[PDB]
Amino acid sequence: TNVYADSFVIRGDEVRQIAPGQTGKIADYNYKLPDDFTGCVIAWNSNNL
Amino acid sequence: ATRFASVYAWNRKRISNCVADYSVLYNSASFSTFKCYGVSPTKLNDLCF
């Protein structure tokens, strides 16, 4: 019905926090996913940019 | 601690008769891995052992 694309940059060690039910400085204070999340999470190294 | 024990002779310290603040540890963000089994990291501070 609709699609929302969210984009941001984080440390490589923080990518593991971008998942439903996660906690930590990023998940708690920056970007929280719902318990019943239905989307996809895509991430890649940007040390070149 | 300045020097840790060798894993074959892993050190153990009993913690008892004291008040903890696990939020100071978890929110330190200094640890690469923080995994809990049978206890939630956030609720850990609202419990007694």
From Swiss-Prot, chain A:
Residues 11-13 are annotated as: Integrin-binding motif. Changing residue 25 to T: In strain: Gamma/P.1. Attaches the virion to the cell membrane by interacting with host receptor, initiating the infection. The major receptor is host ACE2. When S2/S2' has been cleaved, binding to the receptor triggers direct fusion at the cell membrane. When S2/S2' has not been cleaved, binding to the receptor results in internalization of the virus by endocytosis using host TFRC and GRM2 and leading to fusion of the virion membrane with the host endosomal membrane. Alternatively, may use NRP1/NRP2 and integrin as entry receptors. Binds to host ACE2. RBD also interacts with the N-linked glycan on 'Asn-90' of ACE2. Cleavage of S generates a polybasic C-terminal sequence on S1 that binds to host Neuropilin-1 (NRP1) and Neuropilin-2 (NRP2) receptors. Interacts with host integrin alpha-5/beta-1 (ITGA5:ITGB1) and with ACE2 in complex with integrin alpha-5/beta-1 (ITGA5:ITGB1). May interact via cytoplasmic c-terminus with M protein. May interact (via N-terminus) with host bilirubin and biliverdin, thereby preventing antibody binding to the SARS-CoV-2 spike NTD via an allosteric mechanism. This is Spike protein S1. The gene is S. The chain holds residues 393 to 441 of 1273 of the full protein.
